From a paper:
Recently, we obtained crystals of TON_0340 in a precipitant solution containing zinc acetate. According to the plot of 〈d″/sig〉 versus resolution, zinc anomalous signal was present, although it decreased drastically at high resolution.
In conclusion, we demonstrated that protein crystals grown in the presence of zinc ions or soaked in a zinc-containing solution are easily charged with multiple zinc ions on the protein surface and that they are suitable for zinc SAD/MAD phasing.
Author numbering: 11 to 269
Amino acid sequence: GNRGVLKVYLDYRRKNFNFLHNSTKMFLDNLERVLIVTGFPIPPMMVAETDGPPGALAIYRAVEMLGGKAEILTYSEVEKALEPFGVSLARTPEPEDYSLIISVETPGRAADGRYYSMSALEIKRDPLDGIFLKARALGIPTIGVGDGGNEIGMGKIRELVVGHVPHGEKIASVVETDELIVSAVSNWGAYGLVAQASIEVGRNLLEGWDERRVIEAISSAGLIDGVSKTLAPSVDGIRLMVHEGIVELLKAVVDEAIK
Ligand SMILES: [Zn+2]
Ligand SMILES: [Zn+2]
Ligand SMILES: [Zn+2]
Ligand SMILES: [Zn+2]
Ligand SMILES: [Zn+2]
Ligand SMILES: [Zn+2]
Ligand SMILES: [Zn+2]
Ligand SMILES: [Zn+2]
């Protein structure tokens, strides 16, 4: 129940009614070698959180089911966490190397060049948005998912963030992405991408996704809850039940269309 981002969605979707469909389409048309990027350090521990990795993983799993290849660029602690899922890690990634670069909950620099958390605490850690500024310049397909306004891709709608989101002027990221997905919780944004791509392809790419398994797993591995900054199996302060609810609802929707 976060009011600012809810208002940014109404504004955004209102003028870009088809962002999810356009996003899903760019995705489906550039599967050859997809670089997926996640990991949001949380001040002051600067430890990544549970929002982002789950979604990146679902996209990765989906990219492979479709026949493409995916690698993940993220932080150390997330690699450990995502380790049980046998995910290919990116090694000295170069934009030129991919056909598409996605971002699920990743700090995007602000207008002042620095990085900030929803609480405007500066993030001090090596950035991961650079490759996006480069991807953009080269014209490589780029997609970004966020739920607050300080994530890579949110630069596409800074006016909206600055207007409805607390600390906006300072927090808002200037990094833009070709397509942008905004959702209450980024993971859910990635799941939407997968559900939309499922309807488009006629296969439910989300069938089998175990929300609970993944949250608990990565929470044990060390990834924290962004709001409680604790080690609870939750993402952005919402507990597993609601999250499973949304994933099960997305699955239902995918089927309804496919079948
Ligand atoms: Zn407005
Ligand atoms: Zn280059
Ligand atoms: Zn505040
Ligand atoms: Zn966020
Ligand atoms: Zn989040
Ligand atoms: Zn279509
Ligand atoms: Zn968060
Ligand atoms: Zn259920």
